[PDB]
Every structure is written in structure tokens, then in C-alpha cells.
Amino acid sequence: AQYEDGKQYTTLEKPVAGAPQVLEFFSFFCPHAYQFEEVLHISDNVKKKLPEGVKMTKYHVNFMGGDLGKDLTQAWAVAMALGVEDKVTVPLFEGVQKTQTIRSASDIRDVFINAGIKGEEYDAAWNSFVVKSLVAQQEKAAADVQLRGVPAMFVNGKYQLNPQGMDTSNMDVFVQQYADTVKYLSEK
Amino acid sequence: AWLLMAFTALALELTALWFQHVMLLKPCVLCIYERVALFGVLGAALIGAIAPKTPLRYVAMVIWLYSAFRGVQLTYEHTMLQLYPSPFATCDFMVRFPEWLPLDKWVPQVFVAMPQWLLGIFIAYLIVAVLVVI
Numbered sequence: 320a321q322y323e324d325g326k327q328y329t330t331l332e333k334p335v336a337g338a339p340q341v342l343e344f345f346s347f348f349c350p351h352a353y354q355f356e357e358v359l360h361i362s363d364n365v366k367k368k369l370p371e372g373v374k375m376t377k378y379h380v381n382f383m384g385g386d387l388g389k390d391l392t393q394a395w396a397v398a399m400a401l402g403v404e405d406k407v408t409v410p411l412f413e414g415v416q417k418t419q420t421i422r423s424a425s426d427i428r429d430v431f432i433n434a435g436i437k438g439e440e441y442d443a444a445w446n447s448f449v450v451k452s453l454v455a456q457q458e459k460a461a462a463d464v465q466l467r468g469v470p471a472m473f474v475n476g477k478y479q480l481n482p483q484g485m486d487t488s489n490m491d492v493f494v495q496q497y498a499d500t501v502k503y504l505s506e507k
Numbered sequence: 508a509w510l511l512m513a514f515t516a517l518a519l520e521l522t523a524l525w526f527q528h529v530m531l532l533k534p535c536v537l538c539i540y541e542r543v544a545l546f547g548v549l550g551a552a553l554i555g556a557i558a559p560k561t562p563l564r565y566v567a568m569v570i571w572l573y574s575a576f577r578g579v580q581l582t583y584e585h586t587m588l589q590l591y592p593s594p595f596a597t598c599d600f601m602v603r604f605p606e607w608l609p610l611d612k613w614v615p616q617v618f619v620a621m622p623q624w625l626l627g628i629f630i631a632y633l634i635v636a637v638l639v640v641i
């Protein structure tokens with residue numbers, strides 16, 4: 320009746336199984352990335368639309384920044400493993416993009432330190448094997464639903480997301496629309 | 508038409524190309540899309556309807572429709588987003604052809620080894636291209 324392929328989402332041609340219950344790539348570099356999460360607080364909203372215990376999941380991606388591109392991912396890696404994503408999410412964002420203060424692994428290092436992370440325990444799970452592994456998992460989910468750019472969502476490793484099949488003048492609305500779309504798609 | 512566009516096309520076709528490689532290798536996605544609103548309109552506008560024969564100059568008038576039509580907003584959007592971002596957009600580094608037109612990004616993006624001017628010249632090579640022919 321009113322929920323269309325090609326419109327509000329675009330179906331995935333080569334479906335990948337073993338996926339999350341909803342992935343969400345992004346970079347600490349793409350303003351649109353920033354906007355999406357800092358200017359609209361989208362994930363939070365969408366989390367609230369999701370059913371009982373549907374793993375909202377998120378990753379970070381490489382291509383933009385190259386050398387730092389990487390570091391950042393393993394920066395994140397940790398932050399998935401420890402717990403921390405929530406507490407480093409913003410600082411780092413602000414760090415790289417807005418405040419223009421991040422440059423080296425150490426600059427990042429410290430930005431964990433400050434948010435309640437122990438300068439060893441970070442380096443003590445930086446090199447760990449359960450964060451070299453997570454780092455792959457990221458590149459590998461990304462090469463697997465054929466990412467070209469960022470932001471970008473994906474449900475059940477089976478339906479990409481499409482913001483253009485929605486309003487793009489009313490922010491309050493674009494939101495309420497976007498979230499529904501993911502809910503509807505979580506049971507399909 | 509032929510030469511005035513082929514003299515000014517090449518000099519911009521190449522002012523891109525010439526220095527594409529001499530400008531080291533800057534990162535760019537809207538470029539190829541924009542270089543396809545060029546080399547898919549000029550390279551098919553000389554050979555469009557002004558053509559090998561010159562009595563049927565309205566097929567170009569329709570290639571000159573879906574020409575810098577895009578060529579405008581492609582660079583117009585491009586520019587807008589540089590200082591004025593959006594949630595709803597993206598930012599990438601990739602090919603694509605929604606019907607297999609593939610070789611187009613395994614050659615003109617492959618054999619590649621400022622917007623200030625683009626934004627305006629794409630609209631400037633439009634109204635001038637529109638007025639005298641429509």
C-alpha cells in the first residue's frame with residue numbers, strides 16, 4: 320500500500336547472512352556523519368523505535384583520513400570491547416571535526432584517558448586479540464554490503480537505507496519517518 | 508558550433524586532464540559525475556545534432572537539455588555542501604552505473620594518473636548555450 324522498494328529503502332541485491340540486527344557505518348570525518356548523529360541524535364531516536372532487544376549496532380570506516388582513518392577504527396575497536404562507545408562518541412567527534420584538535424594516536428589516546436579510561440587498560444586492550452579481531456569484523460562487514468560512502472544504515476543485512484525516499488525540509492518529520500522505516504524493516 | 512565548443516571543450520577537458528595527474532591525485536567523487544556531465548554532453552554535443560551534418564541541431568537541443576542541466580546542480584550541490592552540510596546526504600569514494608555502463612569508471616577515473624570556477628562555468632556554459640539555440 321505505502322512502503323516501497325526504491326523509495327524509502329533500497330533492497331540489497333547480494334544479501335549477507337550472519338549480519339547484525341542493524342548495522343550502521345559512519346566516519347569521524349563526514350560532517351554528514353556528524354550531522355546525522357550530533358545534529359539530529361538519530362540512533363537514539365531509532366533505538367527507541369526498536370522492539371525488545373533488537374541489537375542496535377554501529378561501526379566506523381576507513382577510507383577517509385587514511386593513516387588516522389585506521390587508528391580511529393582501533394580507537395573505536397577498544398571502545399566497543401571495553402564499553403566506552405557512548406562516552407567517547409562525542410569527544411572524539413568534536414575532537415576530529417569541530418574542535419580541530421586531533422592529529423596523532425596520542426591525541427586520541429588522551430581523549431579516552433579523560434573520559435574515564437585508564438591509560439594502560441586502553442593500551443592493554445588496544446593490542447589485545449579481541450580488538451585485532453573486531454577491527455577486521457569492521458572492514459569485513461563493510462566490504463560485504465558493498466559500502467561506497469557514509470553515513471549508511473542496513474537492516475538484517477538485507478535492506479540498505481534510503482533517506483531520499485522521505486521528507487527533506489522538516490527535520491522533526493524526516494526523523495519520525497526514518498525511524499519507522501527501520502522498525503517496519505526489523506520484522507520482514 | 509563544432510570548433511568553438513571543441514576548442515573550449517579540449518582546453519577544459521584537458522585543463523582538468525593535463526593537470527589531473529600534475530595536481531598529484533586529489534580525492535573526488537562528484538568529479539567523475541561532473542566529468543560525465545561534460546564528457547557525456549560535449550563529447551556527445553559536437554557529435555550530438557550540430558553533428559557530422561548541420562541541418563538537424565535539435566537532437567543536441569535535447570542532449571543540451573539533460574546536459575549541464577545536471578552539470579549545474581551536480582556542481583551546485585557539490586558546492587552547497589562544502590560549507591553548508593546536511594544530515595540526509597553522504598560522502599563517498601566510488602563508481603556506479605544502475606544499468607551496466609561500467610567501463611566509464613574503470614577508465615576516466617582509472618586513467619586520472621578550483622570548484623569556484625566549475626560551479627559558475629557549468630551554469631555559464633548553459634544560459635549562453637540555451638539562449639542562442641532556443
Ligand SMILES: COC1=C(OC)C(=O)C(CC=C(C)C)=C(C)C1=O
Pocket residue numbers: 523527530532533534535537538539541542585621622625
Ligand atoms: C568538473 O568536476 C570536477 C573536476 O573537473 C574539472 C575536478 O578537477 C575536481 C578536483 C580534481 C581532483 C583530482 C580532486 C572536482 C572536485 C570536480 O568536481
